């Protein structure tokens, strides 16, 4: 999960970052530049438990501590109080999160483009492999034309929909499409997934 960790580590310098992938798991981590820490949590009103704290070095000369929360405690829609404390008893982090509000899906797959028909491109893709409740996933399609233009269009795709019909595209231009995914409002939330494997296309006329 190094890709998602580093991707999320961009939005946060030194904060406790948590995310779930398929709603039956949870990973909380942070990075420092050593020291020893203990990870304690409380699912709803259940008694406090401890999480086995892993540690490994990351590039740029820094150590990363992460807790892989036990599957048995991956309950959504309930307050999960987290607390990282130092060996000296001094507090380090403190969050009250909901597992369903920190989703970081994988990148969408199966991107295909078609020229049909009226001078318009039909985009179709598939939701990330083995991902729960595909009908609650909304997407965002990025259109880049190149030649220094960059992103020229970004269309927001409604939840559940996996096809997009693009209009008003300039001819004799080589476009490149990409799709990203995330869980939809209001019963979910999280972060934008990585961009899908891009697909290029050359327009006629």
């Amino acid at each position: 999960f190094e890709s998602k960790a580093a991707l999320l580590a961009a939005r946060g310098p030194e904060e406790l970052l948590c995310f779930t992938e398929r709603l039956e798991d949870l990973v909380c981590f942070w990075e420092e530049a050593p020291g020893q820490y203990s990870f304690s949590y409380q699912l709803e009103d259940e008694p406090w438990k401890l999480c086995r704290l892993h540690q490994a070095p990351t590039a740029r000369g820094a150590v990363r501590f992460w807790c892989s929360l036990p599957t048995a405690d991956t309950s959504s829609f309930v307050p999960l109080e987290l607390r990282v404390t130092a060996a000296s008893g001094a507090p380090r982090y403190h969050r009250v999160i909901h597992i369903n509000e920190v989703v970081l899906l994988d990148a969408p797959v199966g991107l295909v483009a078609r020229l049909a028909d009226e001078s318009h491109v039909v985009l179709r893709w598939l939701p990330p492999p083995e991902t729960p409740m595909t009908s609650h996933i909304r997407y965002e399609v990025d259109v880049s034309a190149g030649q220094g233009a960059g992103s020229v269009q970004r269309v927001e795709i409604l939840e559940g929909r996996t096809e997009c019909v693009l209009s008003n595209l300039r001819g004799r231009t080589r476009y490149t499409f990409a799709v990203r995914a995330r869980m939809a409002e209001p019963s979910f939330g999280g972060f934008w997934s990585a961009w899908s494997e891009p697909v290029s296309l050359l327009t006629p006329s």
Partner: antibody
Amino acid sequence: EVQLLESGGGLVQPGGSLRLSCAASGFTFSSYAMSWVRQAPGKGLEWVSAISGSGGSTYYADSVKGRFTISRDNSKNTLYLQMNSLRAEDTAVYYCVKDRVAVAGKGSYYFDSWGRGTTVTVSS
Amino acid sequence: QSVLTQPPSVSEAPGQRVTIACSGSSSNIGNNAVSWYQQLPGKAPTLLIYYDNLLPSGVSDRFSGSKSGTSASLAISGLQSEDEADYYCAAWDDSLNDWVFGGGTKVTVLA
């Protein structure tokens, strides 16, 4: 691999009492929550009661409030259901259901494993 | 009566396709995860479909689940005599605050 064995069910009359038991094995009992689900003919399945892993949190259906009492013994890996002041409408097959997480509720998404189920009959 | 509505009985010839509806509201099926359960006669209920469309490890490829608005459906393609059982749909309700189920659907296979 998960196995759930119900017991303590049979025939009683309105006002009677029974004590159901669920012998759980094949998994760590104290880490998951448990539920009781009954099926009367024409009423389908109903979520009767549920208890969290530590037993701190309990839920009861509105039709069994004050009459039923759910509990668990983590040392013995057994789920109990104390049925008092029984009514005719309590007549159903009571299933022992293991939850996915440590607390039964919305965040469970689904019921993973069911048991064979014991029958509770209430008549005159 | 049940909160979710299923057809009580459905009869179909072997090898065909069967569609079982499970209509609800905006509080149950509308924005919550739907689950399906199969109950073979005289046996324990098994998890058939979870997460609206996903399939548990060990379930036949012939079973599939879908969801549109306030209604979910179970599809049984290549109908066999082994599939002759009772099928329940379940989802959390937000208007209420408990699990709700359907009346159940008894799939009968002819000869």
